[PDB]
Amino acid sequence: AAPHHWLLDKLSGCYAPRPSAGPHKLRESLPLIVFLRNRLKYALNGREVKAILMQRHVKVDGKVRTDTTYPAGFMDVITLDATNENFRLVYDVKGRFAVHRITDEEASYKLGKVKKVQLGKKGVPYVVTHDGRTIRYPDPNIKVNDTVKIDLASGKITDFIKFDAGKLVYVTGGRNLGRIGTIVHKERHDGGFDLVHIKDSLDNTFVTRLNNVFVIGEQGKPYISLPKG
Amino acid sequence: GISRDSRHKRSATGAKRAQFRKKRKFELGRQPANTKIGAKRIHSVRTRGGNKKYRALRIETGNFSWASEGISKKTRIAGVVYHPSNNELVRTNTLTKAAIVQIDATPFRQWFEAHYGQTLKIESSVESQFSAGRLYACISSRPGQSGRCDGYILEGEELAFYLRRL
Amino acid sequence: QSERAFQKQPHIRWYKNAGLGFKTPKTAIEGSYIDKKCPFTGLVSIRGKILTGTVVSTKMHRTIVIRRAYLHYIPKYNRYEKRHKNVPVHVSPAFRVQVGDIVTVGQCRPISKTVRFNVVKVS
Amino acid sequence: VLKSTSANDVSVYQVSGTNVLEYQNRVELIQDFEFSEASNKIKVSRDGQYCMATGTYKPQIHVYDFANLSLKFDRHTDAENVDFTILSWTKSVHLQNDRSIQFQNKGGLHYTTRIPKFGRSLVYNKVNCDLYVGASGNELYRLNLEKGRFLNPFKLDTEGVNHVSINEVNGLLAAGTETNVVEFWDPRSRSRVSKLYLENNIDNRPFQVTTTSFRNDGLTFACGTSNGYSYIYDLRTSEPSIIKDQGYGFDIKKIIWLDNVGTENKIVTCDKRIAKIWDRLDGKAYASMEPSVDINDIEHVPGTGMFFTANESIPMHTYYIPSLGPSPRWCSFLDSIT
Amino acid sequence: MKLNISYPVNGSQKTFEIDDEHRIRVFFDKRIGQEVDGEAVGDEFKGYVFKISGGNDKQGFPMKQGVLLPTRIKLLLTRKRKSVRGAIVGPDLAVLALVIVKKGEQELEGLTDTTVPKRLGPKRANNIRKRLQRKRHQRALKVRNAQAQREAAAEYAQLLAKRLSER
Amino acid sequence: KGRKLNYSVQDPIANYEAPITSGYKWSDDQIDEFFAG
RNA sequence: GAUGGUAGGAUAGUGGCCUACCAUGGUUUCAACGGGUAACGGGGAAUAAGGGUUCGAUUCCGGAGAGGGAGCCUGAGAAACG
RNA sequence: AUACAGUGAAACUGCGAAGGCUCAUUAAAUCAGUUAUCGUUUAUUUGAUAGUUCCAUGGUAUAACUGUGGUAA
């Protein structure tokens, strides 16, 4: 009854935890019970993960948010107070949620793909992201599928990454879900299979969608740290 | 009303053997409230949470708009002479959207004499109604959904556009 | 160009642009045609996907019946049986489409029972 | 003791008016007599109970049992109604503002059929059972309840008909048209017999006849107009008439006799705001029934002196006349309270 | 019949089983609210007037004030079909309720000469007759909310002005 | 003219009512000597 | 209402979803429309098991029903198992 | 603790039950994925988001409760 992304062992139970509503969707997130209890194993059961949630160790996106099924989606920096645990969780190359450990100056921010820019009411420019941070007043040159950098103390955009040909992009969606390498090709079609294409070890080619891909930095310099093997 | 579904009827291919289903809640066709003239009574019906809908049946105080200056002012209703979305609708003298209804234009006289001084540049076949009192004006607002009677006056081109018709 | 009642007019001569690589002809920007559901001035907005094919019949007005044959890699009897599709489409003030006439259409806002596509191109 | 309006040396009373210590001396006769802000058409069945009142928004049927003084049900019908009849008890036939016809039963909604053009009136024939329905144009249709067929529709004049009625003791089909002609057809022959023309002395504009009626002697015919002018007719010198201008005169809609109770040769006229009652052979007003709101139509209960209107307000008014007659057996303490 | 009688201002009420129905027949065909005399229901209570206030009949069914029809009928009350006796009183009432609004000629050692008091005095301030620190804090939090929000809004609108000047 | 005037026979109304033999209390000779003119 | 156009009604809104008017359309041999079951079986609908090769994990057979049809009401969600 | 002060039958309240059997046989119309809704509803989740003032605190009307009762209920 589980998805593939959670890295959930089959010998666990019968009812799978539906995440509650929140920032991200159901299909692109993992809740805190499947995060803490059975992935990096700070708990043994739902009772004691509710106990540490009542103790309020979790500090995801700089706020506490004491809830069992809180849908932590892409790169919400899970922060735990004891042993200064800073966790940025991204996608691995085979579809799961690889939770990388980072440090404090990297967990002081996150980034987010812009979805739409609106002239909503009363002359106010407007920007949303995958956690829905409706932050005030970016520059006019925010296209769709660019990348804002959230402040995580206040909410303001601090840095901006422009989407164009020659940018380091992350793909979350479809049969390319979780690949990095961002350059063999660029092809913007007019309604589907439109993208920037991603290399491999032998620099192979790949096809995805615009909304299923979003930028993380430059060719060699992302200010996100990434795990390795 | 009854329905909103393609299941009771045929598509662009000509199919049969329908016998489909007990009709759901979200195929809700309410009764056609033919709004008339009377004393102002609006039924406050519910839908989709607290989505109150104003179903007007006997509305009078039409806010009709002077066109060339855009002056939406308050007046009464007389009757619709031509509306061939149903040619019996004008026989029964109801009041729906996009109907051409007659208005005693006395507050428009008051506004003209108030912001121009003299009484009577404006077209002659509406100057005749400036003199007489009853001018033609077409309803914009939806009394069956928003419960209101707003409209726009007939001024020249749109006037002859309807007068050549009927 | 007025054969029906009830103030045949644009609904706020009027002119807009859907963008996205589809031209608006100059009579459809400034001309006497009303463009009620032709998407260049229109009331509809564009979205979705864009399909291309030749026609079969343009008998009634505001009905463009496209044909659409396409390749599909059949593995069953290992030969390609040829595709055919149909879609009705509203008019545009740019081309009286006759038989032949490969044209393309964009998805928007169901107009009749079966039309979501309106002509944006002729070539 | 309910208050009485002033009149010509006569008394009337209203129950369930717009104004009707009062809370603790309430005089309510029929409980739940109020509709959704208007009223379409009310009529009382042939037997001693079971009055039926058509609806206004989400239109209903509203059968009231007179021997229970309250409501039985409200079948929310599919469309808004204009005209119906009652066919004894439980059966009844209706037609809505669209060109559709409903057949209500004890279970309700036995069938929904249609007529090809928009209809305005319906009557039923007790003899050989064909309902005649008057509509717009050349077309006066039949739906026979014997074998459910259709019949060879009656060819009219140009614009149509506002009201159709058949005579009771002999069957003379009336059809009040627009061009002042009354177009009497014969329910035996399925052909015209006469095309009587209606005249006046004022002649404001080309009026249209809107109300037709007969009574149970079979010799006279009550005629209406779209101007507030009652007319009588006989075969005896059928070209003139006696006329009745009314003091407001918009459109008379209900003209009904008093041919089954005492205080004879009297008739009720009813236009949009007022309903009066006068005597035959002079044309002088016996009484009048001025309410606080307009009137959609009226009806008079048989055997006794009471009237039931359908109006444009929330309740319906009932009007009791203690000089025309008594109050009926189910209202048999109205003569004790007032 | 039994007659419930209530003297309301003294707070007294008692039932009296009165047989001998030609005494009772004064009330007959008189609906609710219409007054009555003591003279034709009794002799020992003359100069008495009772406003009737309903009454349960035998089979216990109540009458509601002012409908018609002194038999039983099936109405719609607080909406379902409940049976209710008519407001007019006839021969078949078990109890009939009465309010005495004027004492006549004889004292009653149940109604007049014996009485009960009330319950308890009022509780509300205006009912006894006939906060300001919260008024400080409400006004202070309101003007502080204004001086926070309406200044911060223009304080990022000026950052929009900086972005527009640099663009 | 599709749904307009279907001259068909319908099922529930085929025996919805029943006729009457004498009907009018007058005679047909009374009809003829009633409106000869 | 078959196919579309114009306007209104109703809608949570798109919509011949319904009605007035108008045009005679539309699908099809490049398989329309119609014929049945090992449609108590099938379609990935899904888990797969270190040798069982169509047994071997499950969601769903279709829609209904709270004595029988009908009408109404409530709610973020219903034509309510209450 | 002479205007409240703990136990607390029976009453208002917040919520509970938050998804269970049988019967007639639908061929991508039942179903599964997918495109879109600047074509639309949305409790709850999450991020955001309010500037019109002439010559010291506002009203009876109902409970629970008492009291008189009816009815086989």
Swiss-Prot record, chain B:
Gene3D superfamilies: 3.10.290.70, Ribosomal protein S8e, subdomain
Main location: cytoplasm
Localization per Swiss-Prot or TrEMBL: Cytoplasm
Region (Disordered): 1-30
Note: Present with 15900 molecules/cell in log phase SD medium.
Family: Belongs to the eukaryotic ribosomal protein eS8 family.
Biological function: Component of the ribosome, a large ribonucleoprotein complex responsible for the synthesis of proteins in the cell. The small ribosomal subunit (SSU) binds messenger RNAs (mRNAs) and translates the encoded message by selecting cognate aminoacyl-transfer RNA (tRNA) molecules. The large subunit (LSU) contains the ribosomal catalytic site termed the peptidyl transferase center (PTC), which catalyzes the formation of peptide bonds, thereby polymerizing the amino acids delivered by tRNAs into a polypeptide chain.
Listed name of the protein: Small ribosomal subunit protein eS8A
Species this protein is from: Saccharomyces cerevisiae (strain ATCC 204508 / S288c) (Baker's yeast)
From Swiss-Prot, chain C:
Positions of crosslink type Glycyl lysine isopeptide (Lys-Gly) (interchain with G-Cter in ubiquitin): 8, 26, 36-37, 59, 76, 85, 113, 121
Keywords, sorted A to Z: Acetylation, Cytoplasm, Isopeptide bond, Ribonucleoprotein, Ribosomal protein, RNA-binding, rRNA-binding, Ubl conjugation
Post-translational modifications reported in the UniProt record: N-terminally acetylated by acetyltransferase NatA.
Domain of life: Eukaryota
A single GO cellular-component term on record: cytosolic small ribosomal subunit
Record-linked CDD domains: Ribosomal_uS17
InterPro entries given in the database record: NA-bd_OB-fold, Ribosomal_uS17, Ribosomal_uS17_arc/euk, Ribosomal_uS17_CS, Ribosomal_uS17_N
Subcellular location: Cytoplasm
Biological-process GO terms, alphabetical: maturation of SSU-rRNA from tricistronic rRNA transcript (SSU-rRNA, 5.8S rRNA, LSU-rRNA); ribosomal small subunit assembly; translation
One GO MF term attached to the UniProt entry: rRNA binding
Function text: Component of the ribosome, a large ribonucleoprotein complex responsible for the synthesis of proteins in the cell. The small ribosomal subunit (SSU) binds messenger RNAs (mRNAs) and translates the encoded message by selecting cognate aminoacyl-transfer RNA (tRNA) molecules. The large subunit (LSU) contains the ribosomal catalytic site termed the peptidyl transferase center (PTC), which catalyzes the formation of peptide bonds, thereby polymerizing the amino acids delivered by tRNAs into a polypeptide chain.
Family: Belongs to the universal ribosomal protein uS17 family.
Note: There are 2 genes for uS17 in yeast.
The name this protein goes by in its record: Small ribosomal subunit protein uS17A
Species the sequence originates in: Saccharomyces cerevisiae (strain ATCC 204508 / S288c)
From Swiss-Prot, chain E:
UniProt keyword terms in alphabetical order: Cytoplasm, Isopeptide bond, Nucleus, Phosphoprotein, Ribonucleoprotein, Ribosomal protein, Ribosome biogenesis, rRNA processing, Ubl conjugation
Residues annotated as signal peptide: none
InterPro entries: Ribosomal_eS6, Ribosomal_eS6-like, Ribosomal_eS6_CS
GO MF term set: structural constituent of ribosome
PROSITE patterns noted in UniProt: RIBOSOMAL_S6E (PS00578)
Chain positions of cross-link Glycyl lysine isopeptide (Lys-Gly) (interchain with G-Cter in ubiquitin): 103, 118, 162
Keyword Ubl conjugation annotated: yes
Subcellular location, record wording: Cytoplasm; Nucleus, Nucleolus
GO cellular component, one term: cytosolic small ribosomal subunit
One Pfam family per UniProt: Ribosomal_S6e
GO terms (BP aspect): maturation of SSU-rRNA from tricistronic rRNA transcript (SSU-rRNA, 5.8S rRNA, LSU-rRNA); translation
Record keyword DNA-binding present: no
Further remarks about this protein from its record: Present with 66000 molecules/cell in log phase SD medium. There are 2 genes for eS6 in yeast.
Function in brief: Component of the ribosome, a large ribonucleoprotein complex responsible for the synthesis of proteins in the cell. The small ribosomal subunit (SSU) binds messenger RNAs (mRNAs) and translates the encoded message by selecting cognate aminoacyl-transfer RNA (tRNA) molecules. The large subunit (LSU) contains the ribosomal catalytic site termed the peptidyl transferase center (PTC), which catalyzes the formation of peptide bonds, thereby polymerizing the amino acids delivered by tRNAs into a polypeptide chain.
PANTHER family documented for this protein: 40S RIBOSOMAL PROTEIN S6 (PTHR11502)
Family statement drawn from the similarity comment of this UniProt entry: Belongs to the eukaryotic ribosomal protein eS6 family.
Protein name, as recorded: Small ribosomal subunit protein eS6A
Name of the coding gene: RPS6A
From Swiss-Prot, chain F:
Cell compartments where the protein resides: Nucleus, Nucleolus
Domain of life of the source: Eukaryota
Record's note on what induces expression: Up-regulated during cold stress and following nutrient replenishment by dilution of cells fron exhausted to fresh minimal medium.
Summary of the function given for this chain in its UniProt record: Involved in endoplasmic reticulum to Golgi transport. Involved in a protein-transport step blocked by brefeldin A, which disrupts the Golgi apparatus and its incoming protein flux. May also be involved for mass growth or cell proliferation.
Other comment: Present with 15400 molecules/cell in log phase SD medium.
Stated family: Belongs to the AATF family.
Protein name: Protein BFR2
UniProt organism field: Saccharomyces cerevisiae (strain ATCC 204508 / S288c)
Gene label: BFR2
Residues of the full protein shown: 460 to 496 of 534
